[PDB]
Amino acid sequence: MVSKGEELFTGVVPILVELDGDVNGHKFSVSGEGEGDATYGKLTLKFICTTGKLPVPWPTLVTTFVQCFARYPDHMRQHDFFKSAMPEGYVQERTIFFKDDGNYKTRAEVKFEGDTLVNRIELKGIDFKEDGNILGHKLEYNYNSHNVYIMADKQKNGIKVNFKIRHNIEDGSVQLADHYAQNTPIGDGPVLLPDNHYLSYQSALSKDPNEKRDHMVLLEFVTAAGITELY
Ligand SMILES: [Br-]
Ligand SMILES: [Br-]
Ligand SMILES: [Br-]
């Protein structure tokens, strides 16, 4: 049978993203809007910096900007923590360590407000080099494909996640961003605690030719894998 969480994602769902950020004292806010289609693992989102110029590169915020929209194959449905926590939601905590630079700490509350799936985020960045790849804006406006590794954390009724992002630097090198995370339900009800598996991501970044504010358009596809002889 289809669980209450799953049922909320059977069609296209509007998304609202709100972020308040402070990186080495540079304060900024971002709002985003778009839609998610969990059946296809598809996210289409446009983000605006509402405070002026974004003080870090857009690609460094991609991982922060709704894993409930991942496509879980039917055979892996019992491993979909994110949908099982809905509609009450879940809290994602991350630390993102930029190699030879600073770190972000993020807290995101992901929950429904009516028909809208909301991702409300606080981001704090410290210890950045004012002339490094992040504050010095040396990252290319593009994005590579990565796997995100998920394991159960029974003690916390949630999951622990880790992965490495490689951001292309303008000189042909790479800036590593090591992500460590936990996701835990907001509500007190049962959730699905998964076996080890991963999410496979691909992301494309673009610009709206009619948009004069600092912004990012994101197209992202996310599919669960790692757990699989009928043939
Ligand atoms: Br950028
Ligand atoms: Br891209
Ligand atoms: Br995560």
Side-chain angles (χ1 to χ4, degrees), residues 1-228 230-231:
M1 52 163 191
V2 183
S3 65
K4 293 180 182 298
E6 292 170 345
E7 197 168 325
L8 293 167
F9 291 94
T10 51
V12 177
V13 173
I15 297 169
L16 174 64
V17 180
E18 307 275 353
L19 180 146
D20 281 336
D22 176 334
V23 176
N24 279 35
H26 299 281
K27 298 185 179 180
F28 62 97
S29 293
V30 174
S31 69
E33 60 173 356
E35 64 188 29
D37 186 338
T39 297
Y40 290 165
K42 180 179 194 171
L43 293 177
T44 51
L45 294 165
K46 176 180 171 186
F47 304 91
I48 299 290
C49 183
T50 58
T51 46
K53 171 177 177 56
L54 190 74
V56 299
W58 283 106
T60 69
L61 300 181
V62 167
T63 53
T64 297
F65 292 150
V66 296
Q67 291 160 298
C68 47
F69 291 107
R71 178 172 83 84
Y72 273 74
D74 175 84
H75 70 277
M76 294 184 60
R77 281 161 62 225
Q78 63 264 54
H79 304 290
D80 191 346
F81 167 84
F82 305 106
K83 294 187 190 56
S84 80
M86 296 294 162
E88 302 88 351
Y90 60 88
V91 174
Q92 179 197 83
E93 299 187 14
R94 299 218 178 110
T95 307
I96 305 175
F97 293 96
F98 294 87
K99 186 172 173 68
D100 301 308
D101 213 332
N103 63 87
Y104 297 164
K105 292 188 176 62
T106 64
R107 186 179 187 282
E109 286 188 8
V110 184
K111 69 174 76 169
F112 276 96
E113 295 292 342
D115 282 335
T116 300
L117 193 281
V118 178
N119 188 15
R120 184 182 73 70
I121 308 142
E122 292 178 6
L123 180 154
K124 184 72 165 291
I126 64 171
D127 297 332
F128 288 88
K129 293 174 186 171
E130 299 278 343
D131 61 323
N133 292 322
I134 292 83
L135 292 177
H137 294 272
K138 308 182 190 185
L139 300 186
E140 298 178 352
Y141 191 73
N142 55 31
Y143 219 88
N144 296 312
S145 307
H146 308 271
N147 296 329
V148 168
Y149 298 97
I150 295 171
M151 63 173 49
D153 188 331
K154 286 191 175 181
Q155 292 172 342
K156 295 276 290 182
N157 196 40
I159 54 171
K160 279 190 136 51
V161 185
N162 66 278
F163 57 102
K164 298 178 174 282
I165 298 297
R166 293 164 180 83
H167 296 293
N168 292 356
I169 304 169
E170 60 186 20
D171 67 0
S173 190
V174 287
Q175 170 69 65
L176 177 65
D178 279 304
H179 291 58
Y180 297 84
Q182 79 172 15
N183 296 277
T184 63
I186 293 177
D188 196 37
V191 291
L192 297 174
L193 300 183
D195 288 342
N196 292 7
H197 67 284
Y198 61 97
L199 305 177
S200 175
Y201 281 81
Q202 63 178 73
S203 309
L205 315 190
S206 61
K207 298 292 187 183
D208 177 353
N210 298 305
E211 180 59 71
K212 301 292 293 181
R213 296 170 292 176
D214 198 3
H215 72 283
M216 169 170 71
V217 179
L218 176 63
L219 174 61
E220 186 161 277
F221 294 93
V222 192
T223 309
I227 300 177
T228 59
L230 292 174
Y231 317 97

